[PDB]
Amino acid sequence: MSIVNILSVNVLNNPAKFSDPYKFEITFECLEPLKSDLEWKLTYVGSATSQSYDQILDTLLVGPIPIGINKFVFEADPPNIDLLPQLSDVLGVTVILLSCAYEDNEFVRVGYYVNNEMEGLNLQEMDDAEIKKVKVDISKVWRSILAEKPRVTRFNIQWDN
């Protein structure tokens, strides 16, 4: 029986510049006292279905956890563009995963699609080879998290049983 339940997630700065930190306002309930802290993570997934072009963006240990309703803002570092094969990879649809673990075991994951567009570029009118050659100016790239369409996955964990 799940001790911690996420009730809502609101992105506070959306759309935003690619390089802006992510601000996730998270409300959850803790039904029973827990021995340990909550481990929050935000992961950048550079392309759904293919390779692991991924980046853990930030983490936050939150605790001790007050019983009842909890609300906080997880402000996560933006992606590191040096961890990407090349700049143009930031463009188009990518994924972000907000997750929480307890004693090292993930118990909830909230995934979002993210549209990424550069000022002045219409991506749909350009062929793939042009996208791999176009000069990307990261300061002109906006992300738009598709925040009304979360994918919520829950994993049974042991908590303090």
Swiss-Prot record:
Localization per record: Nucleus
BP terms from Gene Ontology: chromatin organization; DNA replication-dependent chromatin assembly; nucleosome assembly; nucleosome disassembly; transcription initiation-coupled chromatin remodeling
Annotated Gene Ontology cellular component terms: chromatin; nucleus
Domain of life, per lineage: Eukaryota
Principal cellular location given in the protein's record: nucleus
GO molecular function: H3-H4 histone complex chaperone activity; histone binding; histone chaperone activity
Keywords recorded for this protein, A-Z: Chaperone, Chromatin regulator, Coiled coil, Nucleus, Transcription, Transcription regulation
Family the UniProt entry places it in: Belongs to the ASF1 family.
Subunit structure: Interacts with histone H3 and histone H4.
Function: Histone chaperone that facilitates histone deposition and histone exchange and removal during nucleosome assembly and disassembly.
Protein name (Swiss-Prot/TrEMBL): Histone chaperone cia1
Species in which this protein is naturally found: Schizosaccharomyces pombe (strain 972 / ATCC 24843)
Gene that encodes it: cia1
